[PDB]
Each structure stands twice: as C-alpha cells, then as structure tokens.
Ligand binder design. Sequence first.
Ligand SMILES: Cc1cn([C@@H]2C[C@@H](O)[C@H](CN3CCCC3)O2)c(=O)[nH]c1=O
Length: 124
Amino acid sequence: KETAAAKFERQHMDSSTSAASSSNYCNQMMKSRNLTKDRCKPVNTFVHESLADVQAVCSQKNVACKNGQTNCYQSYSTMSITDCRETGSSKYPNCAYKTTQANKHIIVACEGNPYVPVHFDASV
Ligand SMILES: Cc1cn([C@@H]2C[C@@H](O)[C@H](CN3CCCC3)O2)c(=O)[nH]c1=O
C-alpha cells in the first residue's frame, strides 16, 4: 500500500531533471506518474530539487495551509518547479497540459513520524 509520503513523491518529486522541461513535459509526466488514470488531474506541480531539500521544508517557515490547518511550511529558498495545468481542449483519456517552469518558494503540508511532506499546497 502507498503511504502518504510515497504518494507525495510520486505526484510531486522530479529530481531527475533540473528543469529543461520541454513543452512535452507535463503531457509525459502526468501520464507516467499515474495522474491521468481516473480523470485528468487539473493542476499538479513537480519539484526539481533533492528529496532531502524538499523534506527539509517541513522544518522551515510554518504558514497556514489553504484549508486552514496549521501544518504547512514554506521554503526559505526558491526551488525549481514545473506547474502542469490542463488545457481547455483536453479531454479524458487524452489529457493535455501546459508546462510552466518557474523558480518559487514551495508550500507543503507535513505529517507523521518522521515528519515529511504529504501534500503540495502552493507556490509563491
Ligand atoms: C495551487 C496548487 C495546487 N496543487 C494541488 C495538488 C493537490 O493537492 C491539489 C488539489 N486540490 C484539492 C482541493 C482543491 C485542489 O492541486 C499543486 O500541485 N500545485 C499548485 O500550485
């Protein structure tokens, strides 16, 4: 069974590229990480930093989560990320995405022992 920590890694980690992420990136990545299986997931962010660096965000700047919970943390440094957002003409099962690379602070929710990222909240 997939732990919440594992699901965060599958959905949100891509340390293998620094972000040279082509226009193709989101179409390929959303599919291979199984985010287009039951529907087209509308919005999803991939972080291009080490797992150690992203996990360390759980000990960084504590900020309110969008849902009002208090277990969110914003990175002190900007990180290389790619936002994937569904196009208007995207129709399941042919999920289509706009790929946008940026350098931004990430906000993640953390839980558990060890205290690790389990949700991607936002980038700022
Ligand atoms: C704003 C933003 C949201 N997401 C997320 C991942 C997943 O937690 C979220 C789905 N939310 C669930 C309720 C509202 C939307 O899209 C991202 O992956 N990147 C973002 O920049």
